[PDB]
Amino acid sequence: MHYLDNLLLNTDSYKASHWLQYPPGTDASFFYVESRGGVYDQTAFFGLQSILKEAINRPVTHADIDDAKALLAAHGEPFNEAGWRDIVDRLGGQLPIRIRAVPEGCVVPTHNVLMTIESTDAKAFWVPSYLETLLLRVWYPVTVATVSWQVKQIVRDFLQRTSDDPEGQLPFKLHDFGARGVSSLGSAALGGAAHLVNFLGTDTLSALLLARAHYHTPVAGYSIPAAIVAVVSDSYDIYRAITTLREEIIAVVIRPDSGDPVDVVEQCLLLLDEAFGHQVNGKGYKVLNHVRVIQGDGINPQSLRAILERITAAGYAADNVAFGMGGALLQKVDRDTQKFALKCSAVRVDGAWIDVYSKRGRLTLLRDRATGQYRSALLDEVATHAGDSDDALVTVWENGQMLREWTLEQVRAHADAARL
Amino acid sequence: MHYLDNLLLNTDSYKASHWLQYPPGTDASFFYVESRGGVYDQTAFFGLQSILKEAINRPVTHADIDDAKALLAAHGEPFNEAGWRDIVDRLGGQLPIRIRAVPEGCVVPTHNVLMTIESTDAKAFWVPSYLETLLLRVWYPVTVATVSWQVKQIVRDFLQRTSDDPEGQLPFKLHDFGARGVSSLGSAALGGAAHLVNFLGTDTLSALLLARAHYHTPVAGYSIPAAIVAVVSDSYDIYRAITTLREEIIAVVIRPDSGDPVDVVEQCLLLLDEAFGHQVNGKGYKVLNHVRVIQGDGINPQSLRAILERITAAGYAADNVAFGMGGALLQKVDRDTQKFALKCSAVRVDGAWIDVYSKRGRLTLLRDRATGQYRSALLDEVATHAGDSDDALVTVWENGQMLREWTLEQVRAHADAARL
């Protein structure tokens, strides 16, 4: 809300005091963002566009400066009042930085440069450091998009072995139920949007608002009432049909919440097969008539795979089941899941660039044209050093103006094209 | 930001369709919030006041209804347009609900009623259900406040065995460095504020903005530049002093980030003792002269206790060291950490209350006057059933108006008074 609308106070307390730590006569500073490893060996990049639009949505003002100066003095931190007033009076309150990033949705192996931030004004060289806190939080939409993208690759494998329509079934196979279990409305919106990079099903209305506000997508995702109707049940209740109506369900998705996630799915399949029959698809796997099952409980990339391995062995196609994740998708991730870091790699002393500290200097990302494989390099080795690759970063933000910017449908295109 | 400013879309998709699921002729609905167990056996209650102020900050409008009606139809969910227009035209857009809660900061054992939500209009009985999603997220400030409060009890034990000034040293012994590692600015503000329920040190400027906006506290917490100055070092660097300046540090906190959290603290203590001496306090423990140590790395209630057990055995007072937590405090928690639930326990059929489903009916919380112990009971058994206890809940919100409401200094009073 409005009470957070001051970019000068959207940072760590010690970062306000940080401009005094630079050596004398420094003209510039260079930073980069990377994942230093963790659970997965690649990450789908997403979220930066939303973070820039929301966190940097207006010029800094003298009011912002008055408020920050006052709060931080009583808080115990020095504040560069004169440096910030210079930015407002001389630069119209526009942050003198350049941000380059891999196009959102692209899946990049770990230990690679994903974004770079460089200063564009000699006197306000310290501004990138000031923004470390709000930029580093990009770890969250990247990690959520990565978790979601890794689920997609698992489902896709099994929909490729079974199923006559793998890519037509895949977009509806992981549903977001995370709005209850996420830490804030803003995290529900951003993290839910990161899931929509990979799938179409979501119960996080907050994700539709962010995608339509930041990624130019009026309605990014769909759901059904709980025409396709989901009824919440329990494999014992379905077994008690031994009686009841059936046929008016022939003239349905079942969401269970009772039992081991792997088991109750297998039982629902065997019960609903007895109680609906099946067709045998072109790959030789059974597709239930009329009914499908969504396991929205205890779902994580491990139990996810266990369910699919188990129902595939039993002769049932992966078409029959879809999955739901809540807190395990939007909340049970952290900055160390993908070991995310924002590092300074270069400063300009004297008017001469020097490295900092194995990744040093002014850096970018290269994409090999033949193979599509990513590697990080120094900007001095892009052109006239590589007619075999192109610079993979694009300048998305500079000096207050957002340049390159994506629809959610472009983000999904990059992510859908990447495989493991 | 403004793009989230529609309470009708701050919910789960299926909850919009939820009013059709109630049996015919229902006049009311009763809900309650509790922790069903988890890591700890008690929880410090906090955050509801901020959630109400920010999520329910204005009357619902016909514009909200037009927007929700449109988005949800294209999304795939039914929407009670006529029910919401009734709320705006007949009730001024004020939510017909009553919310009662234990005063914030109070520490309540698990499996106890922490809040209740009851409808106050017969025709709009379904409104509490609509708000389940945004209310249940109270798990996050409660869990963060609980984690922080549990750290406090550990530090307090050791400051009671060592240290001549336990309660004067305790407020500065856990510092929040979580702004980098939390999932959103809003989570940084709310979760950081939950830490300030217990301590005064924070680097999360976002927490000061929320506390001054929602808990009437102009500056809730303090920090130091990194007069008390923190220098970031490394036990090997301190050992290389074997030379250098020392004395102008007599005319300092050391923040290390290299090595096992338990070890490097013990070494820094032994090195700085060699390199500064100590005084022996009234309890017989050594207090270093001039220098202190803050371990802001690898800190969790387990390694926290290990450090204190180790330095206490070595004869050093707990005054000598302070601690820092980042993602382990603000992000590495989830809804299952304290098994948080929002359950419906009573509906009104016919004009007659019936239970739902072991906790059923219209419920409240009692506090025994003699012992201060909490238990949950039915509202029908408060007065003329217990001259030995008082109803422990207070009505904080009703029909659009916030009633009882706290300063952060009142919240801290309740939490500081509770012990394990």
Residue numbers in the entry:
A (entry chain A), B (entry chain A): 1 to 226, 256 to 271, 277 to 285, 290 to 395, 406 to 468
Q: Can you quote the paper on this entry?
A:
Nicotinamide phosphoribosyltransferase (NAMPT) plays an important role in the biosynthesis of nicotinamide adenine dinucleotide (NAD+) via the nicotinamide (NAM) salvage pathway. Our structural analyses of Xcc NAMPT, both in isolation and in complex with either the substrate NAM or the product nicotinamide mononucleotide (NMN), uncovered significant details of substrate recognition.
These structures had almost identical overall conformations (RMSD, 0.3 Å). However, since the structure determined from the diamond-shaped crystal was incomplete in domain A, we focused on describing the more complete apo structure obtained from the tablet-shaped crystal.
